[PDB]
Request: fold
Amino acid sequence: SLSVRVSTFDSELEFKLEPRASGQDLFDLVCRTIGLRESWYFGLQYVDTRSNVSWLKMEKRVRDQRVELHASNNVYVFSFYAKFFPENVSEELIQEITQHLFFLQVKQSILSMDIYCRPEASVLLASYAVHVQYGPYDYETYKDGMLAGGELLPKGVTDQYQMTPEMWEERIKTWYMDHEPMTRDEVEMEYLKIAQDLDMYGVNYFPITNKNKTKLWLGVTSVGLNIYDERDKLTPKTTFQWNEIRHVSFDDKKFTIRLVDAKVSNFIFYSQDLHINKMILDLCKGNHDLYMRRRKPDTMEI
Amino acid sequence: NRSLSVRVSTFDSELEFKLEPRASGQDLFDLVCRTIGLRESWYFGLQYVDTRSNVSWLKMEKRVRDQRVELHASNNVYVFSFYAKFFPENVSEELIQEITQHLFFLQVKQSILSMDIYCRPEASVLLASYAVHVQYGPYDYETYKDGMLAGGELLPKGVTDQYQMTPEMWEERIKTWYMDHEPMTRDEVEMEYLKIAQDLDMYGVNYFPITNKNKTKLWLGVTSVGLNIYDERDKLTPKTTFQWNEIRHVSFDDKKFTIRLVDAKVSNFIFYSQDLHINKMILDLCKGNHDLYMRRRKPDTMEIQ
Amino acid sequence: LETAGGAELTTHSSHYLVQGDNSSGISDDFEPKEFILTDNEMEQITNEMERNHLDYLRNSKQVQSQLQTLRSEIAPHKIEENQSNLDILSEAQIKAGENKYSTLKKLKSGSTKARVAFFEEL
Amino acid sequence: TAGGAELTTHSSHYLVQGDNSSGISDDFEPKEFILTDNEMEQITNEMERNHLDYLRNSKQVQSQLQTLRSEIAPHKIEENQSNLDILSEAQIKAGENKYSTLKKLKSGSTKARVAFFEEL
Reply:
């Protein structure tokens, strides 16, 4: 009686739900259907009747959360995404399915330039992406069309060099051949290990201003709160780790952050979208939970 | 300033070392553990008879030479037994290495065969059929030899004295159960033996004779889980008990033990124990068992290389 | 107007501080040397320990009846004047339905003040 | 002969008390736990080493990465480089990476960092 489509980066799910279904009911159905047990990273993202991007809440009904239905033929449409990122994928991601969902989301984040990546690194990344899709390099099967699509490297990379597409393809293939004794999920993890060291990886960016009306970026990460100058998104100017922060609150456009050190002053910043200000609140609370849970590993078992 | 001739007996072999004149207990202890491949060293200790006819455990940071080891009745050799001094709360969740499991298997079985701990007749037959499987492998009709066994060595004498049965009648029942074991490895059957031994009432209880303030004669039972109090004539079932995490402080002065509980509202309780040496052993047993009680519940503290 | 509101009131903590640096005793240098065990962790560990044991009883239900069979098969050959006081105590405990762990849980189910009092009356 | 007495008992720790009302909703255990300051620091040391171990084991790939970057540098169209491209080139020229930078910033006091935040 509720008609639902959920899209992960890997697959699509069409099914019906009772009109009494909570967010928890939907989340659980999705997780159990795809076999995901490391559910704490993930959420259901949709567009509300204010055309705001939101995350499904767990213990309100799906139909009481203002999902936009009109532009979709009355289907509830959701993207299943990772909302939170581990600090070290090697030690923390347990299931292949979890790894694969992170691989696809991170790679699309790089190909679309949501996160900066250097040219020579994007070639390394592309040589793994090829290995994921086609398996180990094999002279028997290799055809030039495997690399010949123009979708392996970010546009920003190829746009800043006077090279033919085939010069890029050959420089990918060279590396693709070089690292061949590897399974698929081994190279997905190699991809992720490279990607997680990118300066913009795992940072949730929000435009803010401090007391002095200086324009800054707030970066909510799995480790804490980064502060970026308005025109440098790679290198934070200062930062605060999750265990240093005691309390986060907003009133209107005004965020107040209180630190564990009682001797230190609260500090303030301004953020103009009220709906963004609740998402900032949610990302802070969620990343902080996982920060402590990571450090008590039994809380992370499946 | 002459070297120390040392002999250590595990339940599996005799080790002979020569130590420096001023070697310490930790030195011998590490030497033993390295030699046999034992990393779960926390259960174990070096026991000896001292120059006072008192059974003692070797101290780790005193010199071996300085711990009153008796030497004349032994041709000047320092003679130690390597024993489990502390017992896990659940063998199958806590004993990690095979050498550890094996050393517990052999010591517990001698406890039972010698009746240091009581065991029921029918349970002794099961234990016996496991012991046989441990020594000879899974039952094989081809290689079995009627008379491969002897009930007088496989059963506590208190069992066989209790019944009008011949040794051969006991042996046939041990053989019949032995035939029926799922074919496990020998180390698997050792663990199964321990899983049954550890449920015996007297398993892992250090008993000491005490008197409360009414001068009632009782038994103090120091265990891996806490302090049991027994009636003078019932070592099987405790009358009352105090778990390690309820106990704040344990001390003795001369014959009088004082035990303070964590709950500040409850008053101390007292008991008397008449040999000072035994009293130090009670104190060491309490501290060691309490240490492992907490460490067991923080499993990282029990990791081995 | 406001749709919702909340406020955190009491923060209470009940826990064990384990400072485990020995001068004597168990000598090995483990880590962490200092740690804190919360009350509910302690009880969570008691519950999973009791559950491990009951799992073991189920998985060995066949061996327990084999033991009962053997016990009554040899019972006609019993020499009662040869039984020890432990044997008598053991059989009585068998009759009453008592085992080591059930007895300990019931004993501990009473306050430490009761048990100290009981002890001093013994 | 011998004597002892225990004097100061001092604790420094983080209290974590979880709740399944909102946010991340799974029923993990333990739900309430405590982490000492030194447990936290020991975990932080361990994480730094895991990363330095990974850098050590990838020395061949990092070397390769700079070979490729040199090999294609002749073809660079600097007028098509981005803001981030220039920032990135400065960062490499100066020997900086994501983690050393963050570690450097956190070594300053929380009092200093809040005030630094405030004159931006």
